[PDB]
Design a binder for this molecule. Structure first.
Ligand SMILES: *[C@@H]1O[C@H](CO)[C@@H](O[C@@H]2O[C@H](CO)[C@@H](O[C@@H]3O[C@H](CO)[C@@H](O)[C@H](O[C@H]4O[C@H](CO)[C@@H](O)[C@H](O)[C@@H]4O[C@H]4O[C@H](CO)[C@@H](O)[C@H](O)[C@@H]4O)[C@@H]3O)[C@H](O)[C@H]2NC(C)=O)[C@H](O)[C@H]1NC(C)=O
Ligand SMILES: *[C@@H]1O[C@H](CO)[C@@H](O[C@@H]2O[C@H](CO)[C@@H](O[C@@H]3O[C@H](CO)[C@@H](O)[C@H](O[C@H]4O[C@H](CO)[C@@H](O)[C@H](O)[C@@H]4O)[C@@H]3O)[C@H](O)[C@H]2NC(C)=O)[C@H](O)[C@H]1NC(C)=O
Ligand SMILES: *[C@@H]1O[C@H](CO)[C@@H](O[C@@H]2O[C@H](CO)[C@@H](O[C@@H]3O[C@H](CO)[C@@H](O)[C@H](O)[C@@H]3O)[C@H](O)[C@H]2NC(C)=O)[C@H](O)[C@H]1NC(C)=O
Ligand SMILES: *[C@@H]1O[C@H](CO)[C@@H](O[C@@H]2O[C@H](CO)[C@@H](O)[C@H](O)[C@H]2NC(C)=O)[C@H](O)[C@H]1NC(C)=O
Ligand SMILES: *[C@@H]1O[C@H](CO)[C@@H](O[C@@H]2O[C@H](CO)[C@@H](O)[C@H](O)[C@H]2NC(C)=O)[C@H](O)[C@H]1NC(C)=O
Ligand SMILES: *[C@@H]1O[C@H](CO)[C@@H](O[C@@H]2O[C@H](CO)[C@@H](O)[C@H](O)[C@H]2NC(C)=O)[C@H](O)[C@H]1NC(C)=O
Ligand SMILES: *[C@@H]1O[C@H](CO)[C@@H](O[C@@H]2O[C@H](CO)[C@@H](O)[C@H](O)[C@H]2NC(C)=O)[C@H](O)[C@H]1NC(C)=O
Ligand SMILES: *[C@@H]1O[C@H](CO)[C@@H](O[C@@H]2O[C@H](CO)[C@@H](O)[C@H](O)[C@H]2NC(C)=O)[C@H](O)[C@H]1NC(C)=O
Ligand SMILES: O[C@@H]1[C@@H](O)[C@H](S[C@@H]2CO[C@H](O)[C@H](O)[C@H]2O)OC[C@H]1O
Ligand SMILES: O[C@@H]1[C@@H](O)[C@H](S[C@@H]2CO[C@H](O)[C@H](O)[C@H]2O)OC[C@H]1O
Ligand SMILES: *[C@@H]1O[C@H](CO)[C@@H](O)[C@H](O)[C@H]1NC(C)=O
Ligand SMILES: *[C@@H]1O[C@H](CO)[C@@H](O)[C@H](O)[C@H]1NC(C)=O
Ligand SMILES: *[C@@H]1O[C@H](CO)[C@@H](O)[C@H](O)[C@H]1NC(C)=O
Ligand SMILES: *[C@@H]1O[C@H](CO)[C@@H](O)[C@H](O)[C@H]1NC(C)=O
Ligand SMILES: *[C@@H]1O[C@H](CO)[C@@H](O)[C@H](O)[C@H]1NC(C)=O
Ligand SMILES: *[C@@H]1O[C@H](CO)[C@@H](O)[C@H](O)[C@H]1NC(C)=O
Ligand SMILES: *[C@@H]1O[C@H](CO)[C@@H](O)[C@H](O)[C@H]1NC(C)=O
Ligand SMILES: *[C@@H]1O[C@H](CO)[C@@H](O)[C@H](O)[C@H]1NC(C)=O
Ligand SMILES: *[C@@H]1O[C@H](CO)[C@@H](O)[C@H](O)[C@H]1NC(C)=O
Ligand SMILES: *[C@@H]1O[C@H](CO)[C@@H](O)[C@H](O)[C@H]1NC(C)=O
Ligand SMILES: [Zn+2]
Ligand SMILES: [Zn+2]
Ligand SMILES: [Zn+2]
Ligand SMILES: [Zn+2]
Ligand SMILES: [Zn+2]
Ligand SMILES: [Zn+2]
Ligand SMILES: [Zn+2]
Ligand SMILES: [Zn+2]
Ligand SMILES: [Zn+2]
Ligand SMILES: [Zn+2]
Ligand SMILES: [Zn+2]
Ligand SMILES: [Zn+2]
Lengths: 762, 767
C-alpha cells in the first residue's frame, strides 16, 4: 500500500505498510475518577460490559469511530481516551512492546521456545503455563503503558507444506488433534480461563483460513487464491478454529491475506459469520482483526473490490471489525459518503473492541490484573519454564548409546553454524531476552574442555573452515555438530525453495564422521531437513532435533546431551525426503493423493516414505507397553456428560496401557495414539490419524506408570464430501506411537451419527 | 396433527393440537440450596448465566433434552428440575395461567383493553405501565406455581387487511412507527428494562413474519405462502421486529405458520439468522419459539419437508429453538437417528431456553422478583390502569354537541348487542377478570334511568326485536346504541368475510334515528366497520369507537359519555368503505397501488376514500395549533447530523434530524387532554411511487384548560425519514419534504434534506 514504485503484490511476499500501522505507541488508561468520561456509563464498574462500551461509543463523532477501526487507534483526546494498540505479538513471548533501552526495567521479556518445539513435548499443562506467564508479563508491561491487552496469537495453521517459512511458529502438521489441543491450552492461558468475566488478555487465533505458504513459486500469500474442497476445509483447514471459538472462547480472530475459493478471507461472510459465529459460537462481542493489511489486499491484488473504499466496506460487512492497516481509517469515510456502509456497521465494530477492553479492566483501576508490575515479570521468568519447555521438547531421533555422553568424555569438538547460537535460538517474533545462553557457553559451564570451530556457514559453498574443524575434531573425545536451518533460511515473507540441509553442511558432517571419534549431530530449526544421509551413516552415532530452544537454549540442549535430563520429545511434523517438494506444486491444497503428482500430504495421507515420521522420538531407557469392544456411538452420545460442556467431547472409551521402564535410566514418557479404519466412512481411507497424546512424569527402572488416553467422539468422526462430521460404524484399530507397541481393535456399531452439519457456502 | 378425521390444513384455520401441548402444568422452582443441582454450576448465583445453563444441560440424557424442546417441558424429575411451561399468554393480561377456582387468591388477573384500544390513546407511558403491571402479575402467579416466566406477546404484525380476525390484538396498521413504539414500550415493561441483567419476564415478539390473515378465501394461515417483495419486507413486514430485537432487546421471538417467498418462517434462516441475529442484534442467548404448531406445518401442509422428522430438523437448523407442539419432542429422536441433527444443535436450543431462565431468577430464591405475591396482583389491579387505558383510548368520531350528555338527559334507551357486554369487553386471550362492569351496570351506577332492549343480535337477521327497542327510544331522553363486531365475528382462526356492520344493526340504527330523539352510536370491536351511512345521517348525532375496553369497560364508556372524562383517542387503523375488500385479493401482499385491482394498502398507500381516516378523533373542545419555532435553517444535512456525537442514544439512527414544535391552545369551553399524530410526505425524495404520507411521531398531552396552552414537541429521528429502495435498503434521501400535524393538517412545515444519500441499513441478500 505504501510502495514508492510499482509493486506486484501477487509476487512480493511482504506488504508495504504505512508507518502509522507499524508505529510503537505509548499507552495509558482512561481516568474514570476525574476525566471527561467520569459520569458516562463506561466508567460505572457495576454496569454490564456491553452497555458500558455502548455508552462510550455514543460519544464519538463519525470520524473518530472510523479512525479507531485501525490497529494503532488514536483514541479520542477530547474524551481523555488514550491511543490504544491492537497489534501486539505474543507467539512465544512479548514482542512489539515498547521495551525500555536502559534503566533495568521492561528491557526484556521471557523468550520461550518456538511453539514447534514446545508442542513436541506433548505436554498440555506446559503449553497452558507458558500462555499464563506470557499474559502475566503482558499485563505487567500494560500497567506501565508498554503493551496492549490483546495479542495476535496463536498461529495455529497446519504446517501442511514442509517448506513454509512460518511453520516454525505452529504446533505442527496435525491441525485436527495436536494443533487444536495447543489452541485450547494456549488461548485459555492467555485469557485466564474459559471466557472468564474478568478477561486477562484477549487472544487472536490466526490465520483464518487456508494460509500456510508465504510465496512459493513466487505466488505471494497476498494474492493467493486457495482452492480447497469443503471436505478439506472442515477436515484440515478449520478444526483448530472451531476449537478456538467453541471450546476456548477466543475473544478475537485474525482473517488471513489469502482468498479461499475466490473469496478473500476478510471479505468472507461464510467464514466470519456462518462458520465462526453460527456454527462455532464465537463470542457475541468478540471481534475480528485483519492481517496487516489484508483489507488492502481485498482490492490489491485480489480485485474482489475495485478500490480501497469498497474493499473496506466489503470487509466490514463480511465481519472484519479491525483493520491492521490504513484502509479502514483512511477510506471508510469514502465508503460512508458512497453509502456503502452505515454508521451502525462502523459503531458495531468499535463497540466490539471496547466491549472487550471493558472486560479486560481498561476502565477499572481496581481490576485484579491492573496491579501486575515488573517484579511479576522477574518472578515468572525466574521459574525457568522457557528452559523447561526446551528440555521437554528436544527430540532424540537416532542413538546407539553414545548419548548421554559418558563420564569418559572430557573434551568436545563443538562444530557448526548453530554452535554459538544466541538470537538464532529465539526464532522469530521475539523481543529482547533477559539473557541468551549459547550451546558454547552452556558446554563450558557444564565442565567440558571445548574446541569451538564454526566449520561452515548455514548456507555457504565455502570450505575454508573445514580443515580447522576436522583438526579440532581429531584432538577431541567427541564431536558435537550443531547446524541445520535458521531464520536466514525460513522466515515470514519467504518460504524455503527446498527441504534439504542448506549449503555444504552435510559434506562437513560426512568428513567429521570419518575422523574416527564419536559424532553427535544436532539438527536445528522449525521445518525439517532431509537427514537420510545421517540416518544411513553408521558413523553418525546420534541425531537430535533441537528446534528453536529459546533463551536457555544451550543449557536445555547440553543438559540433554550430558544426561542431566532425559529427552522425550516427538516430531510434530513429518521429515520428508528432499524430492517430495519437487513432485507436486506446494500450493495444491488437496490433502488426499490424486493418483497423479500429489502423493498425499502429512502423515495422514502421504503414500511415500518419510525419513523420520511424525511422532518419531527415542528415550535414554526402554519401555515395555502393555494393554490394561463394540461401541454404539448413538448410545454413548445419549448419556449425560457431566464435566464436559459439549457432547462431542465425551470419550467413546478410554485407552488404558501400562508403561514399564524396562531399562536402567530414569525417564519421562511420551505417547501419540493413532487410529485407522479400512471400512468406516467414505474412501479413500487415511494412513491413520492422531486421536490422543500424553506425557507422563519420570518413571524409575522397574516402575510402571499408567497411560490413560480418552478417545473423544469428535476424534473418531470422519468428514464426508460435503464437510459434515459424522461418526461412522465399522472396524477401527488403535496403534500406540509410530512403533505401534500396542494395538487395539474395536468396532463401532449402530447408525451413523452426525457431529457437525457443515453449512452451505452462502 | 391430532385430527381424528381427515383435516385439510390448507383450508382449516385452526390446528388440532395434542393435549400435551395444551396441558395446564403445575410449576415450581428447583431447590438450589438443597436439591440434586446444589453442587452444579447452575446453582452458583455468582457464575455467568451462560456457564450456569451449560452446566445444567450437560446433565441431561439426549431424550431429556429432546423432550424439553416442547412448550410443556417435563423437566428432569431425577435432577429436581420441575416441568416448565413456555406457552404463557399476556397480550392484555394473564391467560393460560393455572387460575384457582376457589379460595380467594389467584382466581383472576387484570383484564386490560385489547391493544388496539390502548394504542389509540397515543400514550407511550400507558403501554409501558400496562406491560409492567402484567409482568408483576406474571411473577406473582409464577411464585405460586401458576404461570411461567416468558410470554407469547406482543403481537405486532401490521393490521394490513381490515378483515383480519386478529388485528384486534395489534397496535394497528402502521408497522414502522406506531407498532414499533408499542413494541418497545410493551417489551421493556414486560422485561423490566432494556436487556437488564435481572430479567423480569421474557417477551416473545410475534409473529415473524408475513402473518396477517387467518383464512381469507379459505386459504388457512397454516399453509399460506406470502409473496412479498424485499422492499415491502424491509418497509412494512419487519420494521417492528428490528425494533424488538435491536432497541427493545426482546429475549424471545415467535416464528409464524406461514411461508414467505416459498420458505416457512420457522425453517427460514434468512429470517432467523441473517436478519434477526446478524442485522438487528437479537440477543446471543435469546431463543426462538414456533407458533402452535408451525413446525408441524413445515411438513403438513407446506410440504417443505416430507415428514415430521425432517420438519423438526429443518426448523431446528434454521434457528427455531422451542416447539409449541409435539413435532420436536416426538420426532427429533428420529432426526438424530437419521443423522439430520447433531446433539450439539439440540443442546444449543435447550441451553438458550435455560440461559434465559437463569437470567429470570429461576435458580435464585433471593431474586428480587421471587417474593412478589397475590397482594401485588390486588395492589396493581386496584390502580385501575385497565379503566384508565380504556378511557384514554376511546375515539370520538362524530359529534354535534350531544356528547357529553347534558344534565337534561335523565333517561336513556340503551340499545344493542353490546349494551350488556361483559365477556365481549375482554376480546380474546383473556383469563378470568376480578369483575366486569357492563355498559348497562355503568349507566345505572351513573344515575340514568335506563330502558334496556337488545334490539337485534350482533349478526341478527330478524326485525322482531326492533319494536321494543323503538318503544324504549320513544320513552327516553336519549338513545345510546351499542353494537358493532365482537369475537363471534372476528377471531383467531377465522377472518371476517366483509367489513360492513354485521347482521341488520344498521337497519335498526336507521329506525332508531327516525324516532326524533338524540342518538349516540357506539361502534365496538377491534376491526373497523363501514359507518358511512352513520356519518351521512344528520339524525345520528354522535359516533364513538370503543374497541374492546376490558374489565371496567362500561365505566370508561359512560365516564366519557357523561363528560366525567373527556375523549382523546385516535383511530389506529383506516376505516375502509365496504367495497375495499372485494376489489382485490386480500393476500396480495404488495402495499403499493398497481393501477389495476390494488388501490394501495393502509393510510400510507391507499388511493380510495376512507370512511374515517387513520388518526381520526375529536374532542369535547377545540384546539388552535400554531408552529412554535423552527431551526434557522430548514435545510438539514443528514450525513452531517449523523456525523456528530449522539449521547443519550445507543444507536445513531435514533437521533433527531430536528424537533417539530407547536403550541396547542384550548380554544373551547371544556378542559381536555390532547393527542397528535405527525405525518411527513415527499413528492421527490427517494424512488417512485411516492406514498400519501407516513407517520413519524405522536404524543399525548395532559389536560389543557380553556384558554391555556401546552407545548407539543415531537422529535423527528433519522430512522423516521429513511425510505426503502427496491432492494430493501433503508436510505435517507435528499429532497423536499413536508410535515403535517394530524389528519386535519392544522400545522404544516416544509423542509429539505441536503447532501448525499445516507445508508441507514444495508438489507442483506436472501441466502
Ligand atoms: C378501581 O378499583 C377498585 C378496586 O378493585 C374497583 O372496585 C371494585 O369494583 C367492582 C365492580 O363494581 C366490585 O365488584 C362487585 O362487588 C359487588 C359487591 O361485592 C358484587 O355484587 C358484584 O358482583 C357481580 O359481578 C360478578 C362478577 O364476578 C358476577 O359474577 C355476580 O353475579 C355479580 O353480578 C350481579 O350483579 C350485577 C350488577 O351488580 C348484575 O349485572 C348481574 O346480573 C348479577 O346480578 C361485583 O363483584 C368490587 O367489589 C370492587 N372492589 C373493591 C376492592 O372495592 C373499582 O371498580 C375500580 N374503578 C374503576 C373505575 O375501574
Ligand atoms: C508438564 O508441564 C508442566 C507445566 O510447565 C510441568 O509442571 C511444572 O514443572 C516445573 C518444573 O519442575 C515447575 O517449575 C517449578 O515451579 C516452582 C513453583 O511452584 C518454582 O519454585 C520452581 O523454580 C525453581 O526451580 C527451578 C528448577 O529447579 C529453577 O530453575 C528456578 O530458578 C527456581 O529456583 C520451578 O519453576 C512448575 O511448578 C510445574 N508447573 C505446574 C503448573 O505444575 C510438568 O512437570 C510437565 N509434566 C510432565 C509429565 O513432564
Ligand atoms: C533459572 O533462572 C535464573 C534467574 O533468571 C537464571 O539465572 C541467570 O542466568 C543468566 C545466564 O547465565 C545470568 O546472566 C548473565 O549474568 C552475568 C553476570 O551478571 C553476565 O555477565 C552475563 O552477560 C549474563 O547476562 C543471570 O545473571 C542469572 N540471573 C540470576 C538472577 O541468577 C538461570 O540461568 C535459569 N536457569 C536455567 C537452566 O535457565
Ligand atoms: C478520508 O480520510 C482521509 C484520511 O484522513 C483523507 O485524506 C487526507 O486528506 C487531508 C485533507 O485534504 C490531508 O491533509 C491528509 O494528508 C490526507 N491524509 C491521508 C492519510 O491521506 C481523505 O481526504 C478523506 N476523504 C474524504 C472524502 O473525506
Ligand atoms: C559467540 O557469540 C558471542 C555473542 O554474540 C560473542 O561475544 C562477543 O564477543 C566480543 C569480543 O570478542 C564482545 O565485544 C561482544 O560484546 C560479544 N557479543 C555479545 C552480544 O555479547 C562471541 O565472540 C562468540 N564466540 C565465538 C565466535 O567463538
Ligand atoms: C399516560 O399514561 C400514563 C401511565 O399510565 C398516565 O399516568 C398515570 O395516570 C394515572 C391516572 O391519573 C395515575 O394513577 C398513575 O399513577 C399514572 N402513572 C404514571 C406512571 O405516571 C398519564 O396520565 C397519561 N398521560 C396523559 C398525557 O394523558
Ligand atoms: C421417538 O419418540 C416418540 C415419543 O416417545 C416415540 O413414539 C412412541 O412410540 C411408542 C412405540 O413405538 C408408541 O407406543 C407410542 O405411541 C409413541 N409415543 C408417543 C408419545 O407418541 C417414537 O417411537 C420414537 N421413535 C424412535 C425411532 O425412537
Ligand atoms: C346482563 O349480563 C349479566 C352477566 O351475564 C346477566 O347476569 C346473569 O343473569 C342471570 C339471570 O338473571 C343470573 O342468574 C346470573 O347469576 C347472572 N350472571 C352473572 C355472571 O352476573 C344479566 O342477566 C344481564 N342483564 C340483562 C338485563 O339482560
Ligand atoms: O501473523 C501476522 C503476520 O502475517 C504479519 S506479517 C507482517 C507483514 O508486513 C510487515 O513486513 C510486518 O513487519 C510483518 O509482521 O504481521 C502480523 C502478524 O501478527
Ligand atoms: O399467537 C399464537 C396463536 O397463533 C396460536 S393459535 C392456537 C391454535 O390452536 C388452538 O386452537 C389454540 O387454542 C390457539 O391459541 O396460539 C398461540 C398464540 O401465542
Ligand atoms: C504501487 O503499486 C501499485 C500496484 O500494486 C501501483 O498501481 C502503484 O502505481 C504503485 N504506487 C506508486 C506510488 O508507485
Ligand atoms: C505478478 O506476479 C504474478 C505471480 O508471481 C505473475 O503471474 C505476474 O506475471 C506478475 N505480473 C506482472 C505485471 O509482473
Ligand atoms: C522467483 O523470482 C525470482 C526473481 O525475483 C527468481 O530469481 C526465482 O527464480 C523465481 N522462482 C521461481 C520458482 O520461479
Ligand atoms: C469502487 O469500487 C466499487 C466496486 O467494488 C464500485 O462499485 C464503485 O463505483 C467504485 N468507486 C469509485 C469511486 O471508483
Ligand atoms: C445403538 O443404540 C441405539 C440408541 O441407544 C439403539 O436404538 C440401537 O438399537 C443400538 N444398536 C446397536 C446395534 O447396538
Ligand atoms: C389427519 O389429516 C391428515 C392430512 O392433514 C390425513 O393424512 C390423516 O388421514 C388425518 N389423520 C387421521 C387420524 O384422521
Ligand atoms: C384442501 O384445501 C385446498 C385449499 O382450500 C384445496 O385446494 C384442496 O382441494 C383441499 N384438499 C382436499 C384433499 O380436500
Ligand atoms: C423424511 O423426509 C426427508 C425429506 O424431507 C427424507 O430425506 C427422509 O428420508 C424421510 N425420512 C423417512 C424416514 O421417510
Ligand atoms: C336468518 O338466519 C337463519 C339461520 O341462518 C335462517 O333460517 C333465516 O332464513 C334467515 N332469515 C333472513 C330473513 O335472512
Ligand atoms: C453535508 O455534510 C457533509 C459532511 O459534513 C459535507 O461533506 C457536505 O458538503 C454537506 N453538503 C451540503 C450540501 O451541505
Ligand atoms: Zn479523587
Ligand atoms: Zn484523576
Ligand atoms: Zn490456568
Ligand atoms: Zn467480579
Ligand atoms: Zn480511498
Ligand atoms: Zn431447600
Ligand atoms: Zn419501566
Ligand atoms: Zn444483581
Ligand atoms: Zn400434501
Ligand atoms: Zn407453503
Ligand atoms: Zn416421526
Ligand atoms: Zn362488496
Amino acid at each position: 500500500q505504501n510502495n514508492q514504485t510499482y509493486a506486484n503484490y501477487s509476487a512480493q511476499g511482504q506488504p508495504d505498510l504505512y508507518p502509522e500501522t507499524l508505529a510503537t505507541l505509548t499507552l495509558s488508561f482512561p481516568d474514570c475518577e476525574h476525566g471527561p468520561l467520569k459520569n458516562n456509563l463506561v466508567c460505572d464498574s457495576s454496569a454490564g460490559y456491553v452497555e458500558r462500551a455502548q455508552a462510550l461509543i455514543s460519544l464519538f463523532t463519525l470520524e473518530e469511530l472510523i479512525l479507531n477501526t485501525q490497529n494503532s487507534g488514536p483514541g479520542v483526546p477530547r474524551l481523555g481516551l488514550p491511543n490504544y494498540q491492537v497489534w501486539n505479538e505474543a507467539l512465544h513471548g512479548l514482542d512489539r512492546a515498547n521495551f525500555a533501552t536502559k534503566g533495568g526495567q521492561f528491557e526484556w521479556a521471557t523468550s520461550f521456545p518456538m511453539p514447534i518445539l514446545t508442542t513436541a513435548a506433548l505436554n498440555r499443562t506446559l503449553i497452558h503455563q507458558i500462555a499464563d506467564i506470557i499474559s502475566t508479563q503482558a499485563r505487567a508491561f500494560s500497567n506501565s503503558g508498554r503493551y496492549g491487552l490483546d495479542v495476535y496469537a496463536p498461529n495455529v495453521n497446519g504446517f501442511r507444506s514442509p517448506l513454509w517459512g512460518r511453520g516454525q511458529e505452529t504446533p505442527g502438521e496435525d491441525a485436527f488433534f495436536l494443533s487444536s489441543a495447543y489452541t485450547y491450552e494456549y488461548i485459555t492461558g492467555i485469557q485466564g480461563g474459559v471466557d472468564p468475566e474478568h478477561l486477562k488478555v484477549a487472544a487472536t487465533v490466526k490465520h483464518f483460513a487456508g494460509y500456510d505458504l508465504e510465496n512459493w513459486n513466487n505466488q505471494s500469500r497476498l494474492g493467493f487464491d486457495a482452492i480447497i474442497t469443503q471436505q478439506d476445509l472442515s477436515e484440515y483447514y478449520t478444526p483448530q478454529f472451531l476449537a478456538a471459538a467453541r471450546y476456548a472462547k477466543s475473544r478475537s480472530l485474525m482473517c488471513a491475506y489469502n482468498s479461499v475459493n475466490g473469496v478473500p478471507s476478510c471479505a468472507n461472510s461464510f467464514f466470519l459469520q456462518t462458520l465462526l459465529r453460527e456454527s462455532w459460537g464465537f463470542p457475541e462481542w468478540g471481534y475480528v482483526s485483519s492481517d496487516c493489511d489484508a483489507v488492502y489486499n481485498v482490492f490489491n491484488p485480489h480485485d474482489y473490490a475495485s478500490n480501497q473504499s469498497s474493499a473496506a466496506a466489503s470487509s466490514l460487512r463480511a465481519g472484519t471489525d479491525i483493520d491492521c492497516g490504513q484502509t479502514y481509517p483512511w477510506h471508510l469515510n469514502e465508503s460512508f459518503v458512497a453509502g456503502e456502509v452505515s454508521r451502525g456497521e462502523i459503531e458495531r465494530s468499535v463497540t466490539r473492541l471496547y466491549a472487550n477492553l471493558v472486560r479486560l479492566g481498561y476502565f477499572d483501576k481496581k481490576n485484579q490484573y491492573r496491579s501486575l508490575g515488573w517484579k511479576d515479570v522477574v518472578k515468572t521468568d525466574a521459574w525457568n519454564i522457557s528452559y523447561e519447555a526446551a528440555v521437554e521438547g528436544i527430540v532424540l531421533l537416532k542413538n546407539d548409546g553414545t548419548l548421554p555422553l559418558s563420564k569418559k568424555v572430557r573434551s568436545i569438538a563443538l562444530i557448526g553454524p548453530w554452535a554459538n547460537a544466541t538470537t538464532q535460538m529465539q526464532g522469530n517474533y521475539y523481543g529482547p531476552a533477559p539473557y541468551l545462553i549459547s550451546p558454547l557457553e552452556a558446554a563450558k559451564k557444564a565442565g567440558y574442555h571445548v574446541n569451538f570451530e564454526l566449520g561452515t556457514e548455514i548456507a555457504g559453498n565455502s570450505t575454508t573452515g573445514f580443515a580447522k574443524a576436522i583438526a579440532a575434531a581429531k584432538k577431541s573425545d567427541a564431536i558435537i555438530y550443531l547446524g541445520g536451518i535458521d531464520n536466514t533460511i525460513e522466515q515470514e515473507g519467504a518460504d524455503r525453495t527446498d527441504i534439504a540441509w542448506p549449503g555444504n553442511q552435510l559434506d562437513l558432517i560426512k568428513q567429521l564422521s570419518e575422523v574416527g571419534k564419536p559424532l553427535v549431530v544436532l539438527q536445528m530449526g522449525g521445518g525439517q531437513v532431509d537427514s537420510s544421509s545421517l540416518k544411513s551413516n553408521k558413523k553418525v552415532n546420534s541425531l537430535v532435533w533441537g528446534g528453536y530452544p529459546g533463551q536457555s537454549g544451550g543449557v536445555a540442549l547440553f543438559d540433554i546431551l550430558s544426561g542431566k535430563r532425559a529427552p522425550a520429545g516427538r516430531l510434530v511434523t513429518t521429515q520428508y525426503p528432499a524430492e517430495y517438494v519437487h513432485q507436486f506444486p506446494q500450493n495444491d491444497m488437496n490433502l488426499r493423493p490424486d493418483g497423479k503428482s500429489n502423493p498425499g500430504q502429512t502423515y495422514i495421507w502421504y503414500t511415500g516414505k518419510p525419513v523420520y515420521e511424525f511422532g518419531s522420538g527415542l528415550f535414554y531407557t526402554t519401555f515395555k507397553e502393555t494393554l490394561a469392544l463394540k461401541f454404539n456411538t448413538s448410545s454413548i452420545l445419549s448419556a449425560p456428560h457431566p464435566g464436559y460442556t459439549y457432547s462431542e467431547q465425551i470419550p467413546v472409551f478410554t485407552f488404558e496401557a501400562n508403561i514399564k521402564n524396562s531399562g536402567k535410566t530414569e525417564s519421562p514418557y511420551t505417547a501419540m495414539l493413532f487410529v485407522r479404519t479400512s471400512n468406516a466412512g467414505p474412501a479413500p481411507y487415511p494412513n491413520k490419524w492422531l486421536v490422543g497424546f500424553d506425557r507422563l512424569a519420570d518413571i524409575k527402572p522397574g516402575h510402571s506408570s499408567k497411560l490413560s488416553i480418552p478417545i473423544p467422539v469428535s476424534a473418531l468422526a470422519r468428514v464426508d464430501s460435503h464437510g459434515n462430521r459424522i461418526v461412522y460404524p465399522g472396524k477401527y484399530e488403535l496403534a500406540l506411537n509410530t512403533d505401534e507397541s500396542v494395538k487395539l481393535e474395536f468396532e463401532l456399531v449402530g447408525e451413523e451419527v452426525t457431529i457437525e452439519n457443515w453449512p452451505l457456502e452462502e
